[PDB]
């Protein structure tokens, strides 16, 4: 079992750790058909998505997708710094797999 975001991220192919220590600059949310997704960007232009739920997702990922969207919205509203993101890099925008918040 991983102990941290780096260990977790290393268990997956086509993922990378982004070390940010930045607040979310832009939060975008869509309910439009086939584009039910969240996009965030940071001040340096770096952009990430939480993917539209689909066949690439296990049933066990459906609630976590929703939890992540909740966490990102809260992070945006409170202006807290995001420490690290683990993201799939073979998606555009890069697709969030995990997040780390740190003091």
């Amino acid at each position: 079992t991983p102990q941290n975001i780096t260990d977790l991220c290393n268990e997956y192919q086509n993922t990378m750790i982004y070390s940010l220590n930045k607040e979310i600059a832009t939060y975008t949310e869509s309910l439009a058909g086939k584009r039910e997704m969240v996009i965030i960007s940071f001040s340096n232009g770096a952009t990430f998505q939480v993917e539209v739920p689909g066949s690439q997702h296990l049933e066990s990922q459906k609630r976590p997708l929703e939890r992540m969207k909740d966490t990102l919205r809260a992070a945006y509203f409170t202006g807290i710094k995001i420490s690290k993101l683990c993201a799939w890099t073979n998606k555009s925008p890069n697709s969030i797999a995990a997040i780390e918040l740190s003091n």
Binding site: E23, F77, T78
Partner: protein, 249 residues
Amino acid sequence: AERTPNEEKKVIGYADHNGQLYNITSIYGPVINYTVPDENITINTINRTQLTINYSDYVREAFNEWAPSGIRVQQVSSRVVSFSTTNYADNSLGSTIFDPSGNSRTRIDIGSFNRIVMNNFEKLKSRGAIPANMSPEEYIKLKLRITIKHEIGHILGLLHNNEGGSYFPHGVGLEVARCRLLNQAPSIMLNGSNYDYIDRLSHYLERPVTETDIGPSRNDIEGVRVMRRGGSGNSFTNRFSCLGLGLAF
């Protein structure tokens, strides 16, 4: 304690002409150096009362009231914060000029106190905002500490609760450190034209008010923490001081 209305917990900080909050650390330095002239203050009214007390001990004590904000000070013998007394007798107990250059000045009118300090003595007595126990002497000390603590708020970059969006000589008031979820006493930066702090504080405490009760509220303290770091008035870290609590919903 009763529930203080949001409008009385709202704290407004001084921003410049481009929406950026003044940085009192940058303005005063890491330590706030201030001057206080030697005299004890000589206020007295006729109803005749009599009282004298050192200006220096009250600026001393009032500053310590605000110490939870993380500010640190030091009295410096006569761009430095200036305390003083005046004799305008002009229907205004205290007054402060906030100066971004660092030469902020606070004045305590002595003539105004002698005239209007007890104008609300027994409408406060009978509503029970102050204990019937207290003498004319200590209701004047109460008013003085409140006045001084309130003016310290201005030194530290705060405006009045209801001055969000209002224009001032060096910019505009912008709400800082909002927290509606945590109950607390009314702000000591209530606009005195629209509120009586003692009456509102008593209303909150559900009993008469003494001097161990008065002081900066939780939000007042968080407001100064914002003013100590400055930055954008639209920053969420600056605008909110307990939004994390929203996660518990």
